[PDB]
Every structure is written in C-alpha cells, then in structure tokens.
Symmetry: D2
Subunit: 343 residues, 4 copies
C-alpha cells in the first residue's frame, strides 16, 4: 500500500529547483573544499591557512564578473562559508542568489573504512541530518551533496561496498527530499591503478544500477534528484591510450544503459584530470551521436579554480587577473555544456 512520501507541492519545489540548477548552458562550481584539502592547496601555493585567506579566496571565486551569470546555476559551499560575510556586508548565500545562483552545501562527515574489505570505505554523516537540512534550508541552501568513494582493485569493488554505499546514498536522498532540498548523488569511482576502458565501464554499470535500485527502494522522487558521476577513464598506470571520442562513447553508453530518464540532469566530476582535458571530454560527451534525454553539464571543483588559484598565489593585488582566469575556464565549461566548445 502507498503512503506518499511527498505532497505534489513538494514534488513541485524539488522539480523546479532541479530544473533551475541544471538549466541549459549552466553548471556547478564546487567551492566545498574542507580545511584539510584546502590546507594542502594553500600550502602548495605557499600561504598560511587562516579563516581570512579562505574567506578571501572564496570572495575571489564568488564575486567574479557578471559574465559568469549565465554560467553557474549553483555553488556548493562548505558549512563554514554559509556563515561568512563578504566585505560588502552581504552574506555569501545572498551573494550567490543575487546573481541567479543556487546555494548548496556538502554535508557528509568523511569516509570510514569498512571492515573485511580491501581498503574500501563508506561515507559518514547521517545523524542529525533532518535538523541540519532544516537549518540549511532556513539559511538558503536549496540542494546538497554527498560523496561516496569506490576504488577499482584486484577483486574490488566488492558487492558489500556497492550495496552499503547505495543504501547510504538512498537514505541521505530520502532525508534531503523530506526537507525540500534537492539531493545530488555522487557515486565516485577512483581513477587510480591500471585498468582499461572496459573494466571501469563495467564497474560503472554495476555501481549505477545498484544505486538506482536502492533509490527505487526508498521511494525517491527521481525528478528532483541530480546525478554526479565520473567519466569512465582508464587508470593512471594504465598503458593503453584512447581518443576522447572513445571515452565519450563509453560514458554515454554507461549512462544510457543505466540512468532512468526522469533524473533531471547529470553533472560530471573532473576526477584528477587536467584543466583542459575535462572540458575537452565534456565537449566530446555533448557531441556523442546517441540519444541523451537529460541535461549533461559540469560540476568541477579543481578544474574550474586550480589555475585561477595559481594566478592568485596568495596576493590580493593580482586578484582581478586571477578572477579573469577563472572566468575563462567557466566560459569554456559553459560551451562544454552545449557542445559548441572548440579549443
């Protein structure tokens, strides 16, 4: 017997937010880096990690030129960045919503190793999640993000890891959809190792199928859900070389065999690629001559901001130039969303 999880108005908000995020030509900037990863990135660039430098760097990211207004539909933030204010006086969620963007927040509490596996981990962060999503919904967060990690090994991914990560993602998305927050499932598959297109495509099919079975099990309103997969790409130690067209064909085959078409949009990871390779691959994916009945766009953390961070270097007066650099990649990625990119 059916007791509906959602009223039709709840489905209306989830569908409208998911359509406004993944709108044609728009993408996702992921400024959600935690203090450890951003500490590594500020230590590489050669500055001290303080709250002021992090706030100023996200100022450099967020208040860039109005040319990125038809580029970014939504920005993912850390928890701390929701309660930081810009030097103009405006809080960063209002900064995001003022230029048409949507506020999100990365909500997981890290990765926990699973017993008995070969280095396989699950994700943490389920306690207090309804109250926290209610609080973030009061502060203007309209979507969320959760990151599960899987690695390709000798006999990994085992069935235990895929089952547990799919069940956790479905539980998370149910809780987020209860509170009027569009969830984004991110089934990340680690690119480390040496494996061809074929095996990585294979485990991509198994992982995405288990995810969508668990989503059907937990009554998830799939019209208000976004998918964040990685492009099927060979391992870093894999010796074989492939054109970008084969990678695009393999991605669209791995999606067209799994993703049911009510899922509103597909946002890709960069996954340790270069700044240009991700845009080239996404432009290839948007040019693949099969029938792709959803939005195909980008959600790039490092691939948007890495070289702009390099051109910043920790000095304020370089800012505009660094900001200009960021805009460049954004504009390129916008063309990568519509297939009209050419390098």
């Amino acid at each position: 017997h059916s007791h509906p999880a959602l009223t039709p108005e709840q489905k209306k908000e989830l569908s409208d937010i998911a359509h406004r995020i993944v709108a044609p030509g728009k993408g996702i900037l992921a400024a959600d880096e935690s203090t450890g990863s951003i500490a590594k990135r500020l230590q590489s660039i050669g500055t001290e990690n303080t709250e002021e430098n992090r706030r100023f760097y996200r100022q450099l990211l967020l208040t860039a030129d109005d040319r990125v207004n038809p580029c970014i539909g939504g920005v993912i933030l850390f928890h701390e960045t929701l309660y930081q204010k810009a030097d103009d006086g405006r809080p960063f969620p209002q900064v995001i919503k003022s230029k048409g963007g949507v506020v999100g927040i990365k909500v997981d509490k890290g990765v926990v190793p699973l017993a008995g596996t070969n280095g396989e981990t699950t994700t943490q962060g389920l306690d207090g999640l309804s109250e926290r999503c209610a609080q973030y919904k009061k502060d203007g967060a309209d979507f969320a993000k959760w990151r599960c990690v899987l690695k390709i090994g000798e006999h990994t991914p085992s069935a235990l890891a895929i089952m547990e990560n799919a069940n956790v993602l479905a539980r998370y998305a149910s809780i987020c959809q209860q509170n009027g927050i569009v969830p984004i499932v991110e089934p990340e598959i680690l690119p480390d190792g040496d494996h061809d297109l074929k095996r990585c495509q294979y485990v991509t099919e198994k992982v995405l199928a288990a995810v969508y079975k668990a989503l059907s099990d937990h009554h998830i309103y799939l019209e208000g859900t976004l998918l964040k997969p990685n492009m099927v790409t060979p391992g870093h130690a894999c010796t074989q070389k492939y054109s970008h067209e084969e990678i695009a064909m393999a991605t669209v085959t791995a999606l067209r065999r799994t993703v049911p078409p009510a899922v509103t949009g597909v946002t890709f990871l960069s996954g340790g690629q270069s700044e240009e390779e991700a845009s080239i691959n996404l432009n290839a994916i948007n040019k693949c001559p099969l029938l792709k009945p959803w939005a195909l766009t980008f959600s790039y953390g490092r691939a948007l901001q890495a070289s702009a961070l390099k051109a910043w270097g920790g000095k304020k007066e370089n800012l505009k130039a660094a900001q200009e650099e960021y805009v460049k990649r954004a504009l390129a990625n916008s063309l990568a969303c519509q297939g009209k990119y050419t390098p």
Copy 2:
C-alpha cells in the same frame, strides 16, 4: 573482472533486429495463441477446433493485403505455426519474411502457482531453451516472447513474486541473447479488481525497476531487448473514471521513471481493453508532451484480430471482408504508433 557475454558482431545482430522490429510506424501482431485460448475463441465464434481451422485462420491473418507491409514489423507465432505451410506451398516464416516481417515465437510453458502466496504465479519454460532457440533460429525465428503474470491484490504483488519473475525473465533473456534471438520481456500486470491509477502506477514502477535490476545483474545487452509492458489502467471494478490523457500521462511517467534509454522499443499490451480504446490510448501516449527517447508502438493480440475473427465467423467466403476488417485496425494502430491517429 569482465568476460564479455557477447562478441561485438552478436551485439550488431541483436541491435539490427531490434531496430528492424520497432522501426517507426511498425508494430507487432501476436498470433501466438495456444490451443486452449484459441479453442475458447473458436468456441465463442461457433466452429470446431481443428488444425485446419487454426491454419486457415492464421492464413487469414498472415496473407492479408500489401497495405499492412508498412504496418507489421514482426509476427509472433505459436510453435506449431512455424511448421505449417500455406496453401500456396510457402511456409509461414517465409510468408512473414517475404513481406518484410520478422518471425517470432512464444516460448514459455505456462504459469505455475507459487507456494505461500495469494494466487501468485511464476512462469515455466527454461529447460532445453538454448537448443530450442537454436532450432528456431535455424527456422527463421529472430525474436522471442515470454509472459509473466502479476495481479494487484490486497497485499500482492509481494516481493517474492516480483523477484522470482524478474530473475526468470533475466535468465530467459540471457539464454535468448546467447543464441542470436532478440528477447522481448513482458511484465504483465493483471487489470482485474478495483484499484486507482495511483496504486497500479506504483506497482508498475516497482515491477519494472526490479526487472531492470535483474537485467543489469545478468549482463543483458539492453540495446538488443524489447520491453512489453501494459498501460497503467484502473481495475475493472474500480469506480473512478479517468480521461485518456491521465492514462497517457501516467504511462509515460511510469516509463520515464524506470526504462533506461538504451532499450530499443516499447510495445504495449491491449490487456482486456476494447478494440478502439487501445488505439485511442496509444495515440494519447504518442501525444504526451514529455521526452520519450525510444520507440512507442503496439503489440496487440486480441485488439488486432478480434473483430476480424468476428467478421470471419468460421466461413471461408467471408474471408476478404474479414481480412479487410483486420487491415482497418492495423492501419489505425499504425497511426497510433506515430501519434497522427484521430478516430
């Protein structure tokens, strides 16, 4: 680790046959009625059930006018009809392939009641299936058909019935794809009882999701598979009345939430409807203003041939008129495939 079930040439035959079957404007005639059901139908029309009458009736179905040549892409036969010859001397598979059609065969051995359930049955017919499909492949059968039955009850469909029927359908489709025969999965849901659009839509989602999970489990090449679902329609004793647009919206929602877009085409059942209601509903489904990234066509057993059987009556000299009647429905259903039908 991946050991591929299919060579790329095997995928090439399966994809080419599935594309030739479900080709735009074409549909499926199901003349696959067994001796019991066709015995009931000949006893209703008032003639004796012999081999000659069955052969002559399928002669009346199969050698109709050439106007049905851009109508039927494929015909489903009983096992016996593959070894019957027409009075011209040509065997019925050659009759089908001569006018552009594709030969199929219904291969299941009936329904077996499941213990411990409330009148829920599974399907039979797995033994010797590789040899039988090899034999039918030698005789010109290029696709198959398997029919599982589920009924909506108080606490039915239980998880046991859906799991067992999905596993049996996946096992069947693996065996058929091994031998170069395009399988057609038919997840029939019984329209008996009293239940709204909502509950029947709900169990349609659960059943189709479990089916596609089991197909992903058994490495089924989904580009060479056809889907045969029923239209989500209220029960026969249900008191509420619905327009055809609501039924079309519910069907395309129940498909767009489940069917991955590499599945080549969707052929509907008639499911106890009238001869005109099925064409009206299919014309509505082809006019629904959502994105349907596959072929939507008909596979009508009774809805093509019932009134033509009535106009036959068991007398040979009425034949042409009866045949003319059949052509009428076929032409209508062809328009129901392209959305340009108007009654």
Copy 3:
C-alpha cells in the same frame, strides 16, 4: 578474495567478553534510560527530574547486595552515567567491574521516520561511532547496544524498513567489532495492535533472517555478537488468549528457524509485559523440549526495576527496602535463565 576484518586476538577478546556476559545463570540489567523516558518515569513516581535524582536512583540500582553478583553479568548505561561517580568516590564503571559485571552503553541517537512508509522508522547514530567506541573502550565499556523499532500494521513491516534496519545494524556491529566492543543487535518488534501468534511469529522470522543475511554480508564475527530479540506475543488489542507454553514454543521455533548457532547468547526484551509475566515466559522458554544450542537469558529494563522504583518513591530512607525489592526480581530472573524458576 579474503582480507580478514579481525586478527585472531580480536576474535579472542570478542568471544571471551561475549562468553563472560552470557555466562550460565547471568543476565543483563538495562539502566540505559534516556532523560525523556526516565523523566516520564520520575514524573509518574512524583519527583523532580534532576541529575542528582538520576544519579541516586542508579546508585540504588548498582550498589545493591552481593547476592546479585551471580545474577548480572553486565549493565547497560547511558552515556552520562559513565562519567558519574558514586558517593563512595568510585566511578560507576569501576562499581560494575568490581562485583564482576561488564560495562555497556546505549549508543544510538534515536529514531528517524522513513519517508513513504506507514509510520515506520529507522535508527540514527552512525557518525563518529569509531571514535566514540574508542573513547568508551578507554573508559571500560566492553559491549554496546543499538535499538531499531518495527511495528506490525496492515501492510507493515515493509521490505524497505527491514532492509534498512538490517543494514544499519550490520554497519553498527562492524564498527563496534573493529574497536574491540561486543555488539548487541536488538531487532525490536512493536507489540501494539491486534495480531495473533502466527503473524507476529511470521514477521519475526522475516526480520531475523534479513538481519542475519546482512550480518553475513558485512563479515561480522558472529561468535562475538549478542542477539536481543523480543518474545513473540500477541498484540495488546488481540482478543485471542494463549498459554505461556504456546508462547515458549513459538519463540523457540522462531529462533530455531533463524539463529545460526555460533551466536553466543540470546537476551530477551520485556516488551511492555508485567514484572512477573516476563519471568514466567522466560522460565517457559528455558523449559521448552527442543534443542536450543545457545544461552537463553534476560535483558530487562523495566521488568527488573519498575516495582523497585515504585517502592523507592523518591525518598532516600526507603532505599534498602526498594533495593531488596530489586534483588527479588533479579533472583527470580536468574532462575528464569536456568529454567528452575517456579512462582
């Protein structure tokens, strides 16, 4: 491929602790009541809920006579009670270990309603659980407790609720076994409603089978795990009456059809029964003439302490008499562990 979750020494501690807890004639006192439930219980008895009254009541429970030393193998505490000290100066974990008992702690963070179900809830409390169990392991907690809730309804327990609760229990037990803490799974089935012995026995089989499948999936070392089920008992509004022998037969049938015999012991709930009915039923269960290859004992929260709380009334000078009352039930329950109880 097998990467062992546990070293053999880890299996040795888990097995030794589980054997010391469930040792023949010993049981579990559950003083783990949170502030809301114990607030209701102090408000029923007519005293104000303060930290001093709670500490003093658990003083009344814990420092009772030495006759309970061969009665209680282990005590379950709230988190707060681990950091309270007795008026002698000794902390309550040392009080427990001084008279032969083992310290436990209830670790879940409550129940969260599942979307789309009919009032079905999951359990919360997975974040930070490895660090918290490391901290409690430093403070002397050697076992844990987690409480999932399921209710018998019209079409409940659904498959979603049982699957999610089993996966959460297995994840919890893996985390606890990683840190050297013996987990106790508690699959509670709510006794509310009107349902016979038959349906409650049925859903007990389904729930326990799904739990043990999920435990086999997560590589749980079942020799170091305790099971905390409820006795299969009809609903509160059920009109049919049953002898205690039928309840004992149904419990031992529902366990002997599911529990694999390496699971070290089975501790029952009281589940809203009377103070005497639970002891009578446990004495019947220990007299059932089938082969029960594990320890069958009690884990009684209310059924040990309710009437002793009544004889306390909130006044200190009644203490000994109230404590004497507690000892009575404990002694009775000890006989209920060995089948030699007679009321």
Copy 4:
C-alpha cells in the same frame, strides 16, 4: 500477511520422513549415477554399458546383506531404476522399503553454463516438476535430490552464480515440499584448483548463507529439509598439508556459523576423496568438541561403491565377495556417523 504453504499434517509427514532418513547411525547411499557417469565407470572396469549390467550392478548394491539394514536409511536412485524390477520379481522401491530404507530420486536435468561468468554453471530441471514429483510420490519416492555446482577460481564464485543457484534450490524445495517429498539441497563446491582451508571455508560460508536466505524467502519448512554440503578441504593442486582435525574444525565452524538448527540433518559428500579419507574425516567431524545440534551423517556415492565395483569387475560369480566389500565400507561409514570409528 501469512497464507500458510503447508497444513500441519504436511509438516508432520515432512518431519517424520526427514527424521526417519537421518536417524542416528543411518546414512544415504547414492546409486543415482546417470548413464554417462556410470558409462565412464563401467568403461573403466572394462564391461559394456547395457541396461542389464546397470540393473545387475544395482542389484548387487541393493540386495546386500541384512547387516546394512541399520546402516542405510535411504537410497537415491536414477529415474530408470524406479521402473526396473529385481530377478526375484520385486521392484527396487519395494526392495528398498522392505529392509527399512526410503526411496529417493535425483531429479535435475543437468548443468547449463551461465553467460558472462568464468565457467560457472546453473542447474536445470524445473519444468513439469510438480507432476513428476506427484508421479514419483505415487511410486514410493519420499525424498529427492538436486545438485548445483560451484567452482573456486580467481574471481569466482561470483555473486550472480550464488544468487541464481540459491534461488533455483529454493524454488525446487518449495515444489518438492508442496507434494509431500522431503527435499535435499546439495550446494556442491568444486575441490579443483589450489586454495587453502581459509578461502574454501570463506566461500562455504557465503554460499550457505545465501542458500538459507533464499530458503527463508520462499517459506520453506526447514524442519523437513536435508542439507548436503561438502567438507571444506583444500584444492587438489594446493601445496599446504593439513591434519584431519583442522578439516573437522573448519567444517563444524562453517556449519555452526550458518545452518539454523531446525534443519534436520547434514549429509556430507565424498567429493573426489579416497574411500578411507571420507570415513576418517567424517569420524573426525563427529568427534569435534563443539555443540552440533543436528544429525551428522554420510551421503556417499563413490565412497561406498567404488572398491566394491572394483571387486565386481563385471563378473557375476564374484558377486558375494564384491557385495561383502560394499558392506565393509557401509559398516565403517555407520561408525563414522556415530564417532566411534577407528581405522
């Protein structure tokens, strides 16, 4: 909601037959060899395979001395042997029931390779099984046998093979229990290759757990079911050497972690061992100092009859001596059932 598969009288026959089969000190002779395997065995001994030689050899097996009357509780036959008569005039089922034995029949139709796996096969034989079991029940068959095959490889047994074989075994046992025939599940794991005690024990746990989950899913009355597993033994190419006590400890650990104690008895395979090694191992298993709450006995096809077949050689006049040889092993295996064997 519960609709009981079995009336209590049906449970009474299944329990009584299962108790009479596995009765203390009794075992199973498996004369169920099909024409191919027995053709290989008659070709090794150097005689022509005819119906007369097969009938005469099973005469040599079945009408041996009355000292085997407290040895064999039941005999498994091929389908053909049920309709062969002895030269006295009595049919072989009456021969079996006259000396206290129970007639069984091997009912599967062979093994079929699974697509996409690495040499993994499922089992066949489900069609017409209710009618065939009704027919064999009329002829005196009171139990059955079904044989699924799994091999230990690099990345095998995969989850697909274990799931499919468990579902097929449960479906088979439901059908057999519907007709009043006690099923015997045989989850055979192939001993070929090189693998230690540890990995074979591991996959034994996974396989048996999946089997019992599928049996709980299909409402199987486990008091009327027998289990036929193999002893966990290293591979034929494995270099490490183990005492028989370690093999006995590993078997009883792999059973005590999985088998719920209502399953009436456990009958072992010989699995390519010597004639003496199987009896030594079973005598060790019956001497393992853990709590084994079921009957542990033998079901030996080759290990009972191989050397007796050797002492036959295809000549009639050697018969008695050959028969005497058979009795020897039987008597030894009877002691192997009670732990009082000493070689």
